[PDB]
């Protein structure tokens, strides 16, 4: 995260760390949506252009963390994966359309003050909250600047940006399955996600029922915190059907 601040203890109990077995390293962010399911971006697991193609046995999921590198004894829980599900129509060749993946844990994790799932939006929550100008929150242990690492989880709040503006800021063809967020050059406030943060959650707090909803998944951007550029996120509600499908069937 660029231009964010240290998170408070227990501020994002659904935040998950995707960790590589060997060499041991931070790969991406992710989120806990139930006792046995983790949501992340497909590009974190599969992206041929960068020779990336991980399987269940290649990594670990670490839940309830705050510190980036310390093994937080008696607090964090480390879990193994049983199966990975990448969206059948994930478009990694062109624009990362449908950048989404589900991961099934080998055994359920027990909740605590530091581990708790986030809600998935319903049509009404999405229709009501996904509006230009409304702010969401992004969290992660990623890079602090484009071109180092934080000591503890970082957080930043960013406004959703008008579709036309998102479109006119890049050459990439953007779809209905994505939205962009960030401050404009004239707003006098900065902030963005960066390398290591992708796959992480973009959440919003409903003012109707006071719950936190994951509206997006950090998907892609061109650089980090560059003026006139914006971070792009996977539209979780537009893809909810597939999510329920996988969970209900598997």
């Amino acid at each position: 995260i660029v231009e964010g601040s240290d998170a408070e203890i227990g501020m994002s109990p659904w935040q998950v760390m995707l960790f590589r077995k060997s060499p041991q390293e931070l790969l991406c962010g992710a989120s806990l949506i139930s006792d046995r399911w983790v949501l992340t971006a497909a590009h974190c697991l599969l992206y041929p252009p960068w020779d990336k193609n991980f399987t269940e046995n290649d990594l670990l999921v670490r839940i309830g963390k705050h510190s980036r590198t310390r093994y937080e004894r008696n607090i964090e829980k480390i879990s193994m994966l049983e199966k990975i599900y990448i969206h059948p129509r994930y478009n990694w060749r062109e624009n990362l359309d449908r950048d989404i993946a589900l991961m099934k844990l080998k055994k359920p994790v027990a909740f605590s003050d530091y581990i708790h799932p986030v809600c998935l939006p319903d049509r009404e929550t999405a229709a009501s909250l996904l509006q230009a100008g409304y702010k969401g929150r992004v969290t992660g242990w990623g890079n602090l600047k484009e071109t180092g690492q934080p000591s503890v989880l970082q957080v930043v709040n960013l406004p959703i940006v008008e579709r036309p503006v998102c479109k006119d800021s890049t050459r990439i063809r953007i779809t209905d399955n994505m939205f962009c967020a960030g401050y404009k050059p004239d707003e006098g406030k900065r902030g963005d996600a960066c390398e290591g943060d992708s796959g992480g959650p973009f959440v919003m707090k409903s003012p109707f029922n006071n719950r936190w909803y994951q509206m997006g998944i950090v998907s892609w951007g061109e650089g980090c915190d560059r003026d006139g550029k914006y971070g792009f996120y996977t539209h979780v509600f537009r893809l909810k059907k597939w999510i329920q499908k996988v969970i209900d069937q598997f």
């Binding site: 227990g10 708790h116 809600c119 006071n210 719950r211």
Partner: peptide, 28 residues
């Protein structure tokens, strides 16, 4: 999940975090 999105150390204790007010104020 039944109590999804309600944090043990915040919503459940009726305590607010440092910047959530910023989000709520943006929701006209």
């Amino acid at each position: 999940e039944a109590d999804c999105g309600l944090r043990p150390l915040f919503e459940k204790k009726s305590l607010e975090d440092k910047t959530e007010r910023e989000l709520l104020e943006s929701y006209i």
